[PDB]
């Protein structure tokens, strides 16, 4: 597993950390496709 870290100044990283540990500053994301996926069978030669 590889991971690259921005060589951020330690006093700066510390400040950012403190701010980000606040629930108010919680990060949040959404899945791009954003959907419930469903598959329904269509027997051969079926039309409806």
């Amino acid at each position: 597993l590889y991971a690259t870290f921005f060589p951020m100044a330690h006093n700066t990283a510390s400040t950012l950390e403190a701010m980000l540990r606040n629930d108010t500053n919680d990060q949040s994301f959404n899945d791009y496709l954003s959907a419930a996926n469903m598959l329904y069978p269509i027997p051969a030669n079926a039309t409806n």
């Binding site: 400040t15 701010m19 606040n22 500053n25 990060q27 949040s28």
Partner: protein, 45 residues
Amino acid sequence: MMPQWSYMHISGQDASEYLSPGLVQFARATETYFSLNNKFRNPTV
């Protein structure tokens, strides 16, 4: 459904409004060399 919507940022304010003023300040300041934009969602209603 307002409660869950706001908390999950599906509705309500945008990051520049709900993030602490300090973070927003820091964000703008370092935007050029270290971005935080994609980490906070901004609802569109």
